[PDB]
Amino acid sequence: RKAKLLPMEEALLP
Amino acid sequence: DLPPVAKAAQVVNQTLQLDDSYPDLDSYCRPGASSDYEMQSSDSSWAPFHVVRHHNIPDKVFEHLNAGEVFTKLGLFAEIGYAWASIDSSLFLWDYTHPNPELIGYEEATHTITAVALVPPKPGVFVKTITHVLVVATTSEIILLGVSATPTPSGSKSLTLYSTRMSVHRGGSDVSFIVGTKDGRIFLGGESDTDIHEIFYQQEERWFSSRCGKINHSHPFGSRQQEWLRGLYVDDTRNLLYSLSNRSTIRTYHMEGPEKLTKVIEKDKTSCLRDFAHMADSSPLFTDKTNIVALSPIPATEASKLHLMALTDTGCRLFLSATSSASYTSLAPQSMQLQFVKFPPRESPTRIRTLSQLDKTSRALDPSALGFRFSPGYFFDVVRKHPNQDMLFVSAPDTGRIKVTQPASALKYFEQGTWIELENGNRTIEIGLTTAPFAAAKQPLGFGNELAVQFDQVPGEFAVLTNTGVHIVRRRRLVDIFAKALGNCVSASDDALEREVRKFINQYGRVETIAAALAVACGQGSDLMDRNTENLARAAFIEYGGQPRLASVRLSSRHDALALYLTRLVRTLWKAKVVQVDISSTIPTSKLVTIQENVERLRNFLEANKSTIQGLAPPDIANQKEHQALHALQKLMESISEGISFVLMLFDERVSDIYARLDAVSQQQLKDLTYEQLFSQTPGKELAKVLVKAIVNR
C-alpha cells in the first residue's frame, strides 16, 4: 500500500 | 554535633564525587599502544554482550528485492526501530520490532535511489509533531519528506509521512552518504568525488529564492585526481564534520556558522603512517598497503584531546587527537595527529573452549570490513575472513578494572571482548544504537562510569542489520554477570560460590562486588531459580562483606557497598533542583516513582535481614561506629522516601496556585531547593513544613 502523504499545510507552520 | 541524616548525606556527596572521578578516555589512552584484552566465550556468563532476539526481513521485502532489475539497498533507522529497503526507484520502510509489520511504501521517485537517511528537522520550520526528516537521494534529485514517529502502546514508533514540496536537482555528483546535525543541517557526499554538499530549506517561498537549495562547500577547480568518499561523520559537540576517502584520507570540516562549512584539516594515510613510525611500537599491521575502512567521532563530553577513532582493515583502532593553534577567537582545530593505537586481540573464535608484551602482530581481526564505536567505547568489528560468513568481534572497556586501577600512571585501555557468530549467509550491513546515547557524566571525568548508571538507564542495545534480518545485541552490566554467575552456583558447594566471588573481587574490587550482590539480592537483574539466585546474593553480601577495623575507623566493605548502591539510586536527584519555575518539577514523576521503589526495596531487604546482617542489630569501638554508620544510612533512606512522597503530593495539587499565594523569601527558598537539602538539611525540612501548612489551610 502506497503510504498516504499528508499535505504540506499541516507539516510546516504557521 | 552532626545528626544521622546529615552524616549519611556526607557519605553520599563523597560517593558521588568518587563515581564522577572515573578516568577519562585521554587518561588511559595516553600516547603509546595497548593490546590488553580478556576474552570471554559468547555462551559464558561473563560475556560482555549477547544476542537477545532476531527479526527476519518480511517476505514481501524479499519478493521486491528478488524483483530488482538493477539496484537494491538495505539500511537501518535504529533510533526509532525501523529498517528500510530500496528497490530501483521504490522505497519500503517497516518496524522490525513488530512481529508481522506492514510495509510503508513510497514510490513517487522517478530514478534509482542511491541513499536514504533519517535526520532531525530544522527548528521553527515544521509543526512540532514532525519528529524527523526523511532524505531520499536518487540519481536525479534529493527529496525531503516530513516524518512523525510517535510512540505507540506496544513500544514501537508509529510512522507517518508528509509531503513538503522541498527538492533539488542532484547534479553530476553521486550521493551515497547523508548525515544530519542536531540542528537539522543536511550534508551529502558520494562516490564521484570528495566534495561535500549541503541542502538548505525554509518554510517561506520567495520570489528571489526557492524553498529548498543546494550548494557545494568544497569549491573545487583546476586539476583533480580520482578520489571519492567512503563515509561522512558528524560530531555536534565540536561542530565538526569528518569525511573518509577511498585513499584513506581524513578531512575535518568546521561549522563556523549556521550556513558555513570550512575545511580545517586534511590528513592523508602517509601522515598517519609518519606519526605511527614516530611511535615506540611500529607494526606490520599498518603500512602503505593498509586501508582505513571506517571512522567514529569521539565527542567532547567523552574526551578533550582524542577526537576520532579510525579502523584499519587489519583491525587496528587508531585514536587521533586534534588541537587548535590558539585558545580564543566554537574554536576550529588546525592539526590532527595519531596518538594511540589499540591493536587487535589474538584469540580466534572456536566451537570448543580453548585454554605481557605488547601484541602488535595479531591477525584475528584481519580483514575488518565494517567497524563501529559507541560511547563509552563499545566496539563492533565485522571480520570477513571467509567470503560467506561474517564473524562479529564485540568489546567494551573493562570499566571495573579501569575504576580500581591505581595509580593513574598505571592506567591502560583494558577491555572485555567476545566473538558473536552469525549463521552462514548472514552478511552484516549496518549496526546502530537503539537506546539513548550513553553518558554517566557531563564531562570526560566520570563520563565512562558504567557502574554508576547500572540502575538509571537501561543497558545499551544495538541493532545488527544483515541481509536476512535484524539481530539485537545487548550490553551486559556487572549485576547481569554477577546474577548469571550465581545462577550457576545454585547447584554447588559453599566453596563454589567463594571461588566465583573471588573472580569478581580480583577484577572489580570487594566493594563493587558486594554492591552487586546487594543489588541482585534486591531484585536487580531480575527484569530478565530467581529466588535461589537472590538468596545466594544475600549469602554473598553477608559472608564476604568484611568487618570494621581500627586504622578514626575503617568501615566494612558491606557498609561502603550499601552507601555506593544507595548513592547510585539517587544520583540523578541529589544535586538537582526540586522545581523549575508556571512552576513544574525538574525530575519527571515516573522517574521519582521508580527511584522510590528501589529505595524501598532496599529498605525492605535490610529489615527482613536485620537479624542476620552484621551491624544492623546493636552490638568494640569499630562495631560501634559500624552500627552508627549503618543506622545513619537507613535514616537517610526513609527520609529519601518521605521526601519523594512529599514532592509527588505537591505536584498532585496545583503548585503554581500555591506558589502564587506565597511570600518572596519562601518562593526564593523553593526556587533553589535541592533534593539533598530536602532529604538531609533543616531549612529543607522547615520549608516542606511551610508548603504543607499552606496546602492544608486552603
Side-chain angles (χ1 to χ4, degrees), chain A, chain B residues 2-329 331-698:
Chain A
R1 293 182 182 175
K2 273 187 165 70
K4 178 213 207 174
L5 308 171
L6 296 173
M8 178 213 86
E9 280 66 23
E10 163 146 21
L12 61 92
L13 55 80
Chain B
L2 200 66
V5 298
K7 252 197 175 80
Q10 229 181 323
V11 177
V12 172
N13 287 322
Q14 294 159 16
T15 301
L16 292 168
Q17 285 166 345
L18 198 68
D19 271 340
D20 284 331
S21 70
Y22 177 85
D24 57 276
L25 186 72
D26 291 340
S27 299
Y28 67 84
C29 290
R30 287 169 294 162
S34 168
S35 63
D36 294 273
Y37 296 91
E38 192 184 345
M39 294 297 298
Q40 307 291 357
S41 191
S42 58
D43 64 338
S44 173
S45 58
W46 290 77
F49 303 81
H50 67 322
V51 181
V52 289
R53 66 190 153 257
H54 71 275
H55 304 288
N56 286 281
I57 292 170
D59 290 323
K60 281 150 70 196
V61 178
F62 285 117
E63 295 174 12
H64 289 300
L65 280 168
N66 289 17
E69 284 174 348
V70 179
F71 191 69
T72 64
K73 192 164 180 54
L74 293 167
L76 249 181
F77 293 156
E79 187 195 326
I80 57 169
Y82 275 79
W84 58 266
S86 68
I87 301 96
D88 297 321
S89 59
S90 293
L91 176 61
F92 298 96
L93 295 67
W94 76 92
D95 169 29
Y96 63 77
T97 74
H98 192 283
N100 185 35
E102 71 173 21
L103 298 179
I104 302 172
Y106 172 81
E107 318 189 28
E108 304 304 292
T110 170
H111 289 97
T112 307
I113 292 167
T114 55
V116 179
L118 187 69
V119 298
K122 286 178 183 291
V125 178
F126 299 107
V127 63
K128 261 61 151 53
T129 72
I130 278 170
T131 56
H132 299 90
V133 172
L134 181 67
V135 187
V136 179
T138 73
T139 56
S140 185
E141 59 190 348
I142 299 88
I143 304 163
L144 306 181
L145 295 180
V147 179
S148 187
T150 55
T152 67
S154 316
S156 61
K157 310 287 166 55
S158 167
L159 198 150
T160 57
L161 302 170
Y162 298 73
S163 59
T164 68
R165 308 182 199 161
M166 296 174 178
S167 71
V168 282
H169 296 140
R170 190 199 74 174
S173 294
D174 165 83
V175 176
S176 290
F177 312 106
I178 308 167
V179 295
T181 70
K182 198 175 65 272
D183 301 322
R185 300 184 72 175
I186 300 171
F187 294 105
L188 312 172
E191 303 183 328
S192 294
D193 48 66
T194 64
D195 296 349
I196 290 172
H197 300 82
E198 178 170 8
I199 293 188
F200 303 96
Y201 64 90
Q202 60 186 348
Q203 60 184 45
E204 295 216 39
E205 176 67 286
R206 321 186 181 275
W207 70 270
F208 57 86
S209 187
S210 50
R211 266 210 187 92
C212 184
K214 182 179 179 179
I215 76 177
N216 190 329
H217 280 294
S218 294
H219 308 288
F221 59 86
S223 181
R224 288 170 286 170
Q225 298 172 50
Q226 169 171 69
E227 188 184 9
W228 66 87
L229 295 186
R230 270 170 131 288
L232 286 184
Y233 316 85
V234 174
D235 183 9
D236 292 312
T237 69
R238 311 181 199 260
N239 294 329
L240 296 179
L241 179 69
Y242 304 98
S243 80
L244 180 65
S245 90
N246 67 302
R247 308 184 67 83
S248 303
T249 295
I250 301 172
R251 293 175 170 85
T252 304
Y253 301 78
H254 178 248
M255 296 170 234
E256 56 176 359
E259 304 183 283
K260 283 98 75 179
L261 186 73
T262 305
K263 201 215 303 184
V264 290
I265 310 174
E266 183 170 299
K267 191 184 183 67
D268 58 22
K269 175 164 53 168
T270 302
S271 179
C272 288
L273 286 162
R274 183 161 39 259
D275 297 342
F276 185 60
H278 296 184
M279 303 177 72
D281 311 279
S282 293
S283 168
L285 297 178
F286 188 31
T287 69
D288 72 321
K289 180 63 168 176
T290 307
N291 293 308
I292 297 176
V293 301
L295 304 180
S296 190
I298 300 170
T301 57
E302 185 168 13
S304 172
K305 294 168 185 171
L306 293 175
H307 280 54
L308 192 68
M309 192 196 74
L311 181 67
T312 68
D313 56 22
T314 53
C316 298
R317 279 171 278 169
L318 317 177
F319 289 86
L320 299 103
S321 66
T323 55
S324 181
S325 314
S327 58
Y328 49 88
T329 59
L331 240 172
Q334 297 298 334
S335 179
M336 172 176 288
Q337 181 179 347
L338 170 53
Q339 293 282 16
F340 172 83
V341 180
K342 189 67 196 275
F343 286 99
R346 189 153 284 270
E347 231 195 68
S348 280
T350 54
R351 171 179 176 275
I352 285 165
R353 287 240 193 173
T354 59
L355 265 176
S356 57
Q357 296 297 327
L358 180 66
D359 189 350
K360 61 186 186 175
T361 54
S362 176
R363 307 277 302 289
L365 302 185
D366 180 18
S368 294
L370 299 167
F372 308 86
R373 184 192 183 276
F374 306 98
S375 299
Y378 307 145
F379 174 53
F380 291 75
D381 190 9
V382 182
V383 181
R384 210 157 270 168
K385 278 181 176 298
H386 310 287
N388 71 98
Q389 191 184 15
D390 290 351
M391 294 302 303
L392 232 67
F393 174 72
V394 197
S395 62
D398 195 337
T399 306
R401 195 177 312 277
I402 294 172
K403 179 172 178 292
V404 176
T405 296
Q406 224 65 53
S409 66
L411 280 168
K412 306 192 201 114
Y413 187 5
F414 304 108
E415 282 189 286
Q416 294 282 322
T418 187
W419 283 98
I420 291 167
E421 183 174 5
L422 304 175
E423 291 182 350
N424 165 250
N426 274 280
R427 185 181 205 80
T428 305
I429 293 169
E430 198 183 348
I431 299 176
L433 180 69
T434 70
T435 44
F438 179 96
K442 300 202 167 297
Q443 62 287 317
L445 274 174
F447 176 90
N449 195 344
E450 294 188 286
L451 299 164
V453 295
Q454 288 180 91
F455 322 108
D456 268 316
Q457 57 192 248
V458 295
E461 295 191 358
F462 313 86
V464 180
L465 173 67
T466 73
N467 59 329
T468 70
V470 176
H471 308 261
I472 306 298
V473 181
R474 177 181 296 155
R475 170 63 170 148
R476 286 173 85 147
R477 307 161 295 169
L478 169 58
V479 292
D480 303 311
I481 297 167
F482 192 77
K484 186 89 161 184
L486 263 52
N488 302 333
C489 295
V490 175
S491 297
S493 62
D494 203 328
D495 304 16
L497 177 66
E498 185 183 285
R499 196 232 314 288
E500 203 71 9
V501 164
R502 198 170 301 194
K503 305 178 183 178
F504 286 96
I505 293 173
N506 289 343
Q507 181 182 352
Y508 290 85
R510 192 172 301 271
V511 172
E512 290 284 350
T513 305
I514 297 297
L518 175 60
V520 173
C522 292
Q524 297 289 2
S526 179
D527 294 338
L528 276 294
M529 181 66 125
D530 282 324
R531 177 179 74 107
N532 288 320
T533 300
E534 293 176 7
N535 284 328
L536 256 177
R538 169 183 61 175
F541 183 75
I542 293 167
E543 290 285 312
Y544 314 113
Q547 61 181 21
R549 282 164 177 270
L550 294 175
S552 292
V553 180
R554 289 192 183 179
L555 300 171
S556 72
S557 299
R558 197 178 297 94
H559 164 275
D560 303 329
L562 177 62
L564 187 59
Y565 182 49
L566 174 59
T567 298
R568 290 169 172 175
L569 291 179
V570 302
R571 74 198 304 269
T572 63
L573 254 51
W574 198 253
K575 294 291 181 176
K577 304 294 188 186
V578 179
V579 298
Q580 294 290 329
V581 186
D582 185 273
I583 179 167
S584 64
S585 67
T586 312
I587 309 299
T589 61
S590 62
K591 187 69 182 215
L592 291 167
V593 170
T594 61
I595 293 171
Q596 177 173 227
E597 291 177 0
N598 288 339
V599 172
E600 285 293 348
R601 272 211 64 164
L602 173 58
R603 271 161 49 71
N604 178 36
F605 169 81
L606 300 179
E607 289 309 312
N609 300 276
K610 56 186 164 53
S611 302
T612 56
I613 292 170
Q614 303 88 332
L616 297 185
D620 191 15
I621 316 126
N623 307 275
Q624 264 291 337
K625 300 297 181 181
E626 179 78 6
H627 178 84
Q628 298 168 36
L630 293 170
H631 164 83
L633 289 177
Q634 290 180 96
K635 277 288 176 184
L636 181 59
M637 290 178 223
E638 66 175 41
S639 180
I640 286 162
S641 185
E642 291 177 11
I644 290 169
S645 272
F646 163 76
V647 174
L648 292 171
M649 175 282 296
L650 186 61
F651 283 95
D652 246 72
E653 315 290 306
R654 295 181 183 175
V655 184
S656 298
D657 191 313
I658 277 53
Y659 185 79
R661 312 178 208 175
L662 183 64
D663 28 337
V665 167
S666 298
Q667 290 179 335
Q668 182 77 328
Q669 277 188 269
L670 176 60
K671 213 185 292 295
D672 44 34
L673 170 70
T674 69
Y675 274 97
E676 174 184 17
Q677 297 156 350
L678 176 67
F679 294 153
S680 61
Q681 285 173 35
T682 301
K685 193 231 291 186
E686 290 297 324
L687 177 63
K689 168 167 163 48
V690 172
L691 301 176
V692 62
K693 207 141 175 289
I695 290 168
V696 81
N697 280 2
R698 297 321 307 149

